[PDB]
Swiss-Prot record, chains A, B:
The gene is ME3. This is NADP-dependent malic enzyme, mitochondrial. PANTHER family: MALIC ENZYME-RELATED, NADP-DEPENDENT MALIC ENZYME, MITOCHONDRIAL. Its EC number is 1.1.1.40. GO terms for molecular function: malate dehydrogenase (decarboxylating) (NADP+) activity; malic enzyme activity; metal ion binding; NAD binding; NADP+ binding; oxaloacetate decarboxylase activity.
Length: 565, 565, 565
């Protein structure tokens, strides 16, 4: 692109980083002030306004304005300190900002598709100006993590998720498309909000809903190819599982709430085995919660146990799950298809405390967002049953965590192995023992998986890919980090971690004949590195060249040399 | 335009005001949330965020973001209460905001042309994407009214001035181009500012400067036509006069600081004559100040006196001017070409107070921005010399006014006729007398003059046009307003006032054979009204039609009817 | 964005000329550019055909068709498919070469890419000159061996243009996805080198590593931009180069050479059809080849493959083949052999003439491809008719003037018992006794359109020789029993579209069976799949996808100042 429109193109606009020579060649000289900045200086300038904002919501606003106008500089900001900006452009800030301010994007970021557009989704996809789309993140806004039904304001979530695709993994942002499917909302505050801009009716459900999703998957792959990655985000429990099972073997599709959480949780368990120094087959798991994340984790745990030689039915019996009605047991009321798979042969048990005492688990995993569910008695019981009990308080936000890191370490007398979904600072007990608890962040998983899937044209994503990703993450943890109680690698290394995951995923796919891209690269690291997006500005070179002087003389015909021999 | 780019086009983008039918016809359905708002509702929504801003600077910022994305809605805001938003998008806020924040435009608003681009201005004009430009506002940022040398940050001033062209007069904003000429800056704070984005050297001056201005006028009229209006804004004293005299008879050009201020000041004097009930020839004027505004006013006053039958040399002697060195008298030191024209045959006089006592003027006009120059003694002297003395404290801002309205009315015992450049609230004296002092706003003049000049292709703008504009403004004042002491019509009627001025200017031009547009319209009001820009959204109609059925049948040839007779 | 405005009239894929309806002209914004008559495509065809039949020569008919293809692609293929047997010799062999030799390149719209040896290192940049991004088939030549004519240098661009016309007209391959390329490395044609009007490179042909490097870069650049699945067909290369490039690329790219592999498959198809007359097996036959070039090697290798399929050991199969080059019979120990010729060397004394080889070997089939006129002498034909009841006489050399013998001479000398086929079309033959024969033509168009259609439809990554053998078996079954009784070995060219479809399906079945097809999911109904991809001369629609939402839903989504609360 050239001319005035390049300044309005977020992928190409450099602002004052355009050199004079670049402005003249593009035909834009005069549109930009007479100063030529480096991107380092641009980062300096924008960070001054970023730090002046009084709240995380206002910092998200500033960043979205920057993404609107200069994508490269936006990712220079994000990659300058990914741990600092990840909670601003994504969870938990993105949902809070969209809940409060609505959609602040002043440049269209993706597609809003409604139930009333049924039968015309193919035409709507043609509104997006990029034809080479390789990854889609879609939501219906019904189950925004930690907030619930945000309806059409849920569009902020795929936009923020895709920013982590690029910032943490290096996925080309220009090949990425966020989509909000608006079928209504059951949030009464939104339905009665004069300023709400989504469909003001209750959510369409049943097969009419499923038909819209079917046409969406068909239209996206008709236009962008069957290889296009489609990641589902923040769907409700029942819908999430039905859609995953319906599409995962027909399309290039996964659900990060089910399968990404599974991979990062199992990665923490695998790293804890390096401390407990026992086999996975010796463990007994109690789950606090039975939703999308809990089922995904339990399913991936069973697969990990099978890898160690434990038969499936025997592996399943090592898993005990507690929902809001109590222990999930055979013949109990209020069960569904997924819950029946882990139903134990045991009488009803009402409380998690009693389940812990009856089962005596080696590991407890909470994802139910019930604050304080890991009571002092539970922590005491576990520390008495086993030398090094594993305590995973994975619920978000911090106010809904099953316990704090400090309570776990204090009550277990420094022997509990802890991980959380929320960031906890270092803990120093009274006797001097220091712990650095890790955070089970989904960003350890989906950037590298997406990068490898996109790089190789991986047709479908079996759960073995999420299991090998968990295994790669667990080995990123150094021996010194383990001695500090850290079960996850530093988030500051996420781009290197995602790159190594992408390579392992790509290698797995070629060996299983799942990759569509050919020829198979001999050097997979070099191949994937060549697709990693950098915040560095590109260069508009002209690729000028000449022919040899003798060639140009004989090929240039004039009246003087027309009859030369 | 159609497709995704219409959402990025400020002139065509309606945002959520696009109906579903419009989105489908433009091929943008899906890029916009599934709600269809009226412009009234859009105005409601944006005004909520506008009123939440804590300062005028922040309100200017919000408005510039809106102008960046939706020009029609921007002018709906401005025209909703023009008196409220004029001081935000223009003086005094625009200069303060640009001084503090720099240039906040995230969409290019015009052209930055530097002295180092000499010889290539024609190429730079091709960077602007609009080919049909009919009005240019240019500055070099040296004398921003009330602030001084803002260098390249002066670009905000032509951008804000053009907003008043459109909001107050109805000039088509798409045909308007703001230009900043950067020749350097002598503001030491800017030269040492790490964040300053203009040329970091002192101002180029002399003929090298004049050569750049010559090439600018040549390039603009070469590309857009010799009829293109070029308005000079916020140039320094000497440059402003030299450039006006050099270009006003060669191009379609005026300087609003010299000639616009002149017209609005004379309009106030003419309206005061309706109260003093005497002839202009009976007046004696003392000027506090001798810069651009003072000279423009004095020159237009002489022309008004000539119209009443007073010969020029005799008319000039009714004008006494005081600069910072004292009364301008023949043979005095520190005089220039303009000052010598009004030099009186009198010994040197140091102070304005003594000049008032020696001259006993009927009217005093201050534009020198010296606070309190109209002392209690001056006001007392004038009220003793004449029944209804005219007191024009025209300097900006309020803190630099020669006196307040209340001081004028109190000291003159309610007999002084007052106007100011700054807004003063109503004044009620102790004896019950109430006054509503008017503000001599330049926006009474340049919108209507520009609208008439553009509508008619008026080749040059003689000062008679500014004199007839003053006469039109003075007659807009109602008899009831005069009894309240108001010398100017309400600013809420500015669009109607500008329209009547444009018609009178257009009529003058055709009678003097100055208008280029032909044929001469018989109904000039209807003609000008047809060019007035409204904040109303336009409509993308398809203009579909059919031929008569018999025509379509005979003109449609098939194998079946090929040989019909 | 769908193409609109004046440019659609210059778009050969979309321009309909006067077949644009009034509704379409207004929708596209082109009304006024076209005369005021609305023609059906049938009437357009009638109009162009009257001008076509008025041309006095095949060369002039070619020029008329080329100016039509320049302006209206759909009407062009309406003409071609109205009688493909009539127009095939006009747009391709033999007319295309004679036309380009005489007139040069008459295209007035750019048809493809001229890439020269002097452009080495910049081929990726040159591909970006072609305005179509979605290319699925490339036909490339260096013009060295135009069939029947020799070295035409850069005038050889006509051959890929004409070849691709047959892809679409004969097979139904989408023409918009097709790209012809001329590689200019010079020419050894002395008439072109001394012609002041020649527009190619004016030097002898560059050979050696620089030539090979250019071809390597061409294959890399084409597949880098359009994908590794892009079909690349080599045409009219010199014999040594053609074989060497085929072996280098056929397992790395989706590539084949029609002069070698297409000729082999159609020749074997004729032999297999002759078996339905001789009513014996392929292993009962003994082949003598007049000519030992690479086209003869192509036929010989495919024959050995067909013999192995019958169960003949490879060594036994190869000994059924006797080849005669310019030096005589290829025997063991003979001088002037080469690597490929020694594979078919027989343990036999040296024999100088083809006539003596025929008498000593007594072949059941003789195949001439050496382009030696009259090589099948009366003695050879008389001997064949006395050795076997129904000898096979294949005079496949081109052009007609260099055929080994005419159809009349074969039928007369063999007393009506010889089974004849040629590469040139011979008319019907009636001997003096009344016996009538209809000799068939071994046209490469029986092969490459269906192969290309199936390869492109399935994303078949490489084209093994098994595909050309099964294509030959399909063609041999197409001939009716009645046509065999008349001496016809090939199906009527008027059925080529149906034959091509059946070949494409068989190729697709084979590819999915052996994991060669990259398109997924594998279609259950291969016939319906391919039919959906076949291009038709029917003009495409411009129906706008407009619709409304339910009335109540749209009312709730429509927000005004009145219904805001």
């Amino acid at each position: 692109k050239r001319g005035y429109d390049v300044t309005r193109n977020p992928h190409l606009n450099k602002g004052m980083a355009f050199t004079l020579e670049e402005r003249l060649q593009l035909g834009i000289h005069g549109l930009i002030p007479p100063c030529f900045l480096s991107q380092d200086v641009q980062l300096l300038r924008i960070m001054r306004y970023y730090e002046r904002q009084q709240s995380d919501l206002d910092k998200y606003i500033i960043l979205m304005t920057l993404q609107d106008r200069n994508e490269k500089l936006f990712y220079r900001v994000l990659t300058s300190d990914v741990e600092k900006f990840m909670p601003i452009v994504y969870t938990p800030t993105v949902g809070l900002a969209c809940q409060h301010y609505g959609l602040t994007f002043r440049r269209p970021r993706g597609l809003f598709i409604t139930i009333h557009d049924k039968g015309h989704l193919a035409t709507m996809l043609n509104s997006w100006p990029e034809d080479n789309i390789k990854a889609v993140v879609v939501t219906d806004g019904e189950r925004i993590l930690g907030l619930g039904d945000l309806g059409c304001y849920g569009m902020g979530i795929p936009v923020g998720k895709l920013a982590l695709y690029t910032a943490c993994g290096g996925v080309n942002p220009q090949q990425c498309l966020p989509v909000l499917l608006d079928v209504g909302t059951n949030n009464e505050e939104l339905l009665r909000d004069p300023l709400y801009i989504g469909l003001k009716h209750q959510r369409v459900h049943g097969k009419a809903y499923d038909d819209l999703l079917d046409e969406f998957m068909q239209a996206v792959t008709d236009k962008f190819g069957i290889n296009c990655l489609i990641q589902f985000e923040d769907f409700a429990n029942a819908n999430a599982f039905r859609l995953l099972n319906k599409y995962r073997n027909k399309y290039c599709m996964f659900n990060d709430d089910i399968q990404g959480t599974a991979s990062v949780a199992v990665a923490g368990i695998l790293a804890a085995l390096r401390i407990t120094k026992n086999k996975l087959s010796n463990h007994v798991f109690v789950f606090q919660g039975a939703g999308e994340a809990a089922m995904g984790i339990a399913h991936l745990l069973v697969m990990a146990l099978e890898k160690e030689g434990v038969p499936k039915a025997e592996a399943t019996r090592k898993i005990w799950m507690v929902d809001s009605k109590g222990l999930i047991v055979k013949g109990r009321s209020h069960l569904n298809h997924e819950k029946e798979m882990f139903a134990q042969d045991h009488p009803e048990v009402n409380s998690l405390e009693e389940v812990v005492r009856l089962v005596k688990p080696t590991a407890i995993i909470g994802v139910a967002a019930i604050a304080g569910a890991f009571t002092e008695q539970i922590l005491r019981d576990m520390a008495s049953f086993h030398e090094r009990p594993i305590i995973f308080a994975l619920s978000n936000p911090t106010s809904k965590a099953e316990c704090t890191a400090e309570k776990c370490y204090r009550v277990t007398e420094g022997r509990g192995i802890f991980a959380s979904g929320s960031p906890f600072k270092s803990v120093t007990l009274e006797d001097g023992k220091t712990f650095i608890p890790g955070q089970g962040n989904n960003a350890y998983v989906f950037p590298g998986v997406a990068l490898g899937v996109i790089a190789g044209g991986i047709r479908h994503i079996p759960d073995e890919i999420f299991l090998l990703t968990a295994e790669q993450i667990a080995q990123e943890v150094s021996e010194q980090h383990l001695s500090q109680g850290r079960l996850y690698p530093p988030l500051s290394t996420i781009r290197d971690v995602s790159l190594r995951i992408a390579i392992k995923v790509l290698d797995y796919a070629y060996k299983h004949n799942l990759a569509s891209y050919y020829p198979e690269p001999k050097d997979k690291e070099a191949f994937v590195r060549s697709l990693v997006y950098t915040p560095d500005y590109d260069s508009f070179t002209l690729d000028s060249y000449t022919w040899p002087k003798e060639a140009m003389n004989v090929q240039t015909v004039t009246r003087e040399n027309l009859y030369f021999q």
